[PDB]
Design a protein around this ligand. Structure first.
Ligand code: NZS
Length: 828
């Protein structure tokens, strides 16, 4: 089993047995603590359903999809060898019903995909079916034998200390210091709990040298017993802020931190990295600090009610005053009757006092209203952010998540994984939760893998914790998937090498095109796996490369344009699988943005609205490097312009409509392309405005020959958004005018906008989290408070409607101005 731990390590990209960077045994302890949850989920999953991983949903079929059906008669073409026959099926009839309705043990696998139509669920509740109906595609399935469940086989007293807590600051040491002669530095020690500072003590400013000694006893104002579980000893060096490092004061065994510590610190407000209990691995170049330290048990007046309700009604980002907190607390039993008051109520708690925390735990023991309340993801997410370090509080959040069906877990998987960074300890209810769902479902497990590996590869701050979690998963996912992952990682590594090697050698000369195709030839020949799963789409199995179609794109970061053949013989079309390999950008920012877009879509699904967004696949695999899905038949908006007038930025209003008339043959399809455009344009206008990324160069905007608009390059990020005159022309308008299509556009936008405001809290918390865990450069107070204004928090539906309509009018008044300006900067 020695080559087994080796296998996991090479699959993880980090050695979880390496104890070189620890000052305790929390990590190793967590490895053991996860064994039970690991085996408890492996021994309780249905082998058959787990092997076929049916992808289903319990949500009602949207309205725009019901009208796609004729007589409640959905046609399903079945194949078995070379023959084939169609069948009329009831949307409410099970796959089993269809089976007996066919013969009148075999299962219905989807053609070309590793997807299965199995289980006791209506045919209308399969994602693949809903996908087909939406795209007007025809459902084709092949009849073959169920996968062998054998292939999944798995390898067999603190409260008696009244003393004021204190820490001795021996000094700070650094091998080599910056060439900035010569500043002064002091050490600032904070006792934190959920980004809430309980006490703060500094040292005296000393001359900045490679060795600074203090030997100073910093005595805090907080007693030892009043120390809460999860409290952090935050040590920071100023000059302003240069270094930081954290130390849990209460360990994973409820023991008060004791003894000597030499901690290596991180170099440089609301960043999630600043919360980590991990120390800097680089011991030879990093700043170090030396400290010294020397078990934990387990009727209202009318006016006041109005006041409390008003408080409870405010948005998540609305600051609580001292008065507000005192009201919430004093009336905590009434506040408990409102689930939406929980985040605010638990922010009113003084965790710096044992007596209060005790009363708080008494309160939580009375969870009847919370338990019986319906799941509010936005509300549940709020309790898992940086503002809550109490495991009891956070546990009741993870509690409500338990009722999520695999469908919704996939919706919030990425950000749930990111929320692990907010956990005080490596072992958490959230961590075990992700682990559980990952083992219960292959699709969730697949993406869990890549999301964790994403962080492990380019995050020294949390790679250790995530490595321990990933290892736990890999020891239960099964032999089959362990093999898949292995193949996937192999091909990725090989391709990333080629990407970097190519980038080294603006024009794409022949010497590079030859070298690329040359390199790809060497790999495909006895060096590359014959087949592998597409990481951003586990259903697809890629095969051999199409070297003829492979190229280096004309961008300054020289991304690889790759094309594969579907390794599945039963595949219908002969289209290639397109993947863009790129180094230079942080694709983690793209993942989050795209994930948010998918969330905005499902939200619109609840309102029976359908904006035709194109949230393509984008997986971050390493440092400034990852893969992208290639959308077929798509070109840049700016490129459609460059066709007529390339060099100069002399943009013309009509080109777009011409380009569409050209790429559609029947004129009927042209109208379907225009309508598709009007919707896709509306959605991307609304979604982009809310996220504050609407001001882009139309080179970062693309369109499908079918009229499907969609943005790209979100790493890179005046007008509210992009509504240029050429788009407007396709809508049948130019200046002081209108159109049957423009009236439509304005209608769909207001619908979409008002629909998102119905999930304000949920968007706010996701946006806030996005900045803190994914965008190190965008983590200020005002950076997050943008989305409040964007969603017009605390406004009438009418006002908001007009507010956005004004934003639209701003695009009309600007015309090509901002685009032309983009043309001067980006182009020149
Ligand atoms: C100038 O732009 C061009 C030119 C030619 C083809 C394309 N191809 C694409 N480019 C991008 N961007 C994001 C990923 S990138 O940074 O590696 C490349 C840009 N996304 C795309 C496609 C096709 N599908 N999707 C989702 C773009």
């Amino acid at each position: 089993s020695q080559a087994f731990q080796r296998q996991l390590t090479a699959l993880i990209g980090y050695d979880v047995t390496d104890v070189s960077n620890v000052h305790d045994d929390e990590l190793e302890f967590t490895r053991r603590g996860l064994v039970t949850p690991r085996m408890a989920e492996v021994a309780s999953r249905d082998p058959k359903l787990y092997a076929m991983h049916p992808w289903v949903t319990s949500k009602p079929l949207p309205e725009y999809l019901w009208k796609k059906i004729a007589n409640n008669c959905i046609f399903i073409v079945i194949h078995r060898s070379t023959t084939s026959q169609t069948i009329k099926v009831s949307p409410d009839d099970t796959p089993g019903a269809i089976l007996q309705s066919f013969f009148t043990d075999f299962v219905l696998r989807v053609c070309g995909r590793d997807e299965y139509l199995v289980g006791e669920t209506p045919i209308k509740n399969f994602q693949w079916v809903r996908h087909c109906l939406k795209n007007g595609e025809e459902i084709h399935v092949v009849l073959d034998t169920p996968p062998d469940p054998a292939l999944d086989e798995v390898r067999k007293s603190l409260w008696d200390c009244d003393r004021k807590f204190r820490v001795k600051i021996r000094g700070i040491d650094i091998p080599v210091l910056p060439r900035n002669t010569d500043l002064t530095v002091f050490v600032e020690a904070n006792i934190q709990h959920g980004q809430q500072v309980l006490c703060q003590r500094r040292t005296s400013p000393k001359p900045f040298t490679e060795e600074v000694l203090w030997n100073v006893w910093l005595e805090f104002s907080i007693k030892i017993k009043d120390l809460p579980k999860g409290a952090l000893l935050n040590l920071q060096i100023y000059c302003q802020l240069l270094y930081y490092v954290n130390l849990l004061l209460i360990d994973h065994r409820f023991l008060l931190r004791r003894g000597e510590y030499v901690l290596h610190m991180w170099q440089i407000s609301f960043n999630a990295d600043k919360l980590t209990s991990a120390t800097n691995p680089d011991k030879e170049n990093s700043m170090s600090i030396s400290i010294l330290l020397d078990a934990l048990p387990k009727e209202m007046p009318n006016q006041l009610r109005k006041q409390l309700e008003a408080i409870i009604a405010t948005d998540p980002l609305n600051p609580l005053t001292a008065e507000d907190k005192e009201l919430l607390w004093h009336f905590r039993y009434e506040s408990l009757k409102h689930p939406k008051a929980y985040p605010k109520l638990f922010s009113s708690v003084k965790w710096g006092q044992q007596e209060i925390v005790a009363k708080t735990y008494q309160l939580l023991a009375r969870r009847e209203v919370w338990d019986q309340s319906a799941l509010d993801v936005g509300l549940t997410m709020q309790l898992l952010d940086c503002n809550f370090s109490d495991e009891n509080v956070r546990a009741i959040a993870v509690q409500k998540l338990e009722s999520l069906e695999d469908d919704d877990v996939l919706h919030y998987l990425l950000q749930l994984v990111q929320a692990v960074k907010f956990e005080p300890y490596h072992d958490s209810a959230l961590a075990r939760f992700l682990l559980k769902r990952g083992l219960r479902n292959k699709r969730i497990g697949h993406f869990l893998f890549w999301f964790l590996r994403s962080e492990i590869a380019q995050s020294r701050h949390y790679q250790q914790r995530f490595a321990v979690i990933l290892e736990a998963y890999l020891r239960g996912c099964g032999t089959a998937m362990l093999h898949d992952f292995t193949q996937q990682v192999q091909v990725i590594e090989m391709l990333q090498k080629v990407t970097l090697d190519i980038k080294s050698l603006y024009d794409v000369s022949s010497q590079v095109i030859s070298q690329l195709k040359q390199k790809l030839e060497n790999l495909q020949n006895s060096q590359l796996p014959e087949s592998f799963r597409v990481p951003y789409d586990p259903g697809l199995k890629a095969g051999a490369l199409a070297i003829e179609k492979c190229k280096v794109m004309a961008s300054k970061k020289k991304p690889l344009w790759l094309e594969f053949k579907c390794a599945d013989p039963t595949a219908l079309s002969n289209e290639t699988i397109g993947i863009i390999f790129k180094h230079g950008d942080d694709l983690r920012q793209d993942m989050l943005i795209l994930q948010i877009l998918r969330i905005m879509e499902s939200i619109w699904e609840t309102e029976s609205l359908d904006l035709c967004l194109l949230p393509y696949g984008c997986i971050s695999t390493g440092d400034k490097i990852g893969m992208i899905e290639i959308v077929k038949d798509a070109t840049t908006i700016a490129k459609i312009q460059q066709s007529t007038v390339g060099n100069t930025g002399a943009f013309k209003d009509e080109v777009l409509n011409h380009w569409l008339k050209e790429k559609s043959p029947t004129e009927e399809k042209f109208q379907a392309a225009v309508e598709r455009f009007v919707y896709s344009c509306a959605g991307y206008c609304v979604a982009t405005f809310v996220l504050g990324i609407g001001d882009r160069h139309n080179d970062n905007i693309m369109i499908t020959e079918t009229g499907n608009l969609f943005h790209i390059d979100f790493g890179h990020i005046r007008v509210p958004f992009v509504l240029t005159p050429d788009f407007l022309f396709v809508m049948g308008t130019s200046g002081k005018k209108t159109s049957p299509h423009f009236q439509k556009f304005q209608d769909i936008c207001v619908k979409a906008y008002l629909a998102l405001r119905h999930h304000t809290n949920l968007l706010i918390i996701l946006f806030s989290m996005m900045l803190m865990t994914g965008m190190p450069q965008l983590t200020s107070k005002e950076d997050i408070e943008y989305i409040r204004d964007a969603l017009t928090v605390g406004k009438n539906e009418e006002d908001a409607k007009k507010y956005f309509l004004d934003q639209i009018e701003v695009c009309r008044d600007k015309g090509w101005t901002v685009q032309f300006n983009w043309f001067l900067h980006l182009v020149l």
